[PDB]
Amino acid sequence: MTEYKLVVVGADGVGKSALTIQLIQNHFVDEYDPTIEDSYRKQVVIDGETCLLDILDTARYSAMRDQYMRTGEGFLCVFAINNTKSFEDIHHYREQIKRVKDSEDVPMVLVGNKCDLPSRTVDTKQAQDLARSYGIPFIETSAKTRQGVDDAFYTLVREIRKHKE
Ligand SMILES: Nc1nc2c(ncn2[C@@H]2O[C@H](COP(=O)(O)OP(=O)(O)O)[C@@H](O)[C@H]2O)c(=O)[nH]1
Numbered sequence: 001m002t003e004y005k006l007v008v009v010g011a012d013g014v015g016k017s018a019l020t021i022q023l024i025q026n027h028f029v030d031e032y033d034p035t036i037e038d039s040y041r042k043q044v045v046i047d048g049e050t051c052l053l054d055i056l057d058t059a060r061y062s063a064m065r066d067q068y069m070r071t072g073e074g075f076l077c078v079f080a081i082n083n084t085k086s087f088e089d090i091h092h093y094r095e096q097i098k099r100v101k102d103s104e105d106v107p108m109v110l111v112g113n114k115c116d117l118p119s120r121t122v123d124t125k126q127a128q129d130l131a132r133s134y135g136i137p138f139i140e141t142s143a144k145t146r147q148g149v150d151d152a153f154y155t156l157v158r159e160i161r162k163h164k165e
């Protein structure tokens with residue numbers, strides 16, 4: 001039973017918790033304490049392959065945190081489409097991941113969340129441009145409506161598979 005270790009990173013309030021819960025528990029969480037960091041596991045079938053997702057929802061001493069940075073195989077870098085600052089913060093996250101992994105080639109997906117909202121300040125092109133700049137996928141999601149939620153997580157799994165060959 002093959003296991004994939006994922007880490008969800010990004011600025012506070014982007015929807016890291018909501019996304020993880022939406023994937024795992026299949027519901028939208030209205031309020032989840034921002035200070036809580038925890039791991040969640042689920043057995044899933046991705047592209048005909050049954051596997052175990054092991055995801056850390058970051059809030060940012062914890063040995064669990066340390067282990068996931070060390071052993072985690074792929075990172076969701078999350079911003080919100082209505083939060084310019086959060087998009088601006090993305091590069092910070094990437095540099096942290098690069099350092100921890102000691103590698104330019106770490107499996108990652110840029111996720112633009114809250115795309116159910118009209119109040120959009122980060123346009124598709126901007127995020128695609130950044131994604132292409134890093135050579136990673138960009139995926140637009142809504143935790144509230146489930147739009148692209150499995151896609152974001154499954155894409156990252158596919159990024160990991162590439163790295164493993
Ligand atoms: N409209 C909308 N609200 C969202 C979405 N994702 C999260 N939220 C809300 O944004 C707030 C912060 O989300 P949370 O998951 O706690 O973000 P975190 O701090 O990054 O873990 C909460 O009020 C969530 O219900 C989404 O896709 N659409």
Ligand SMILES: [Mg+2]
Pocket residue numbers: 016017018032033034035036057058059
């Ligand atoms: Mg949270």
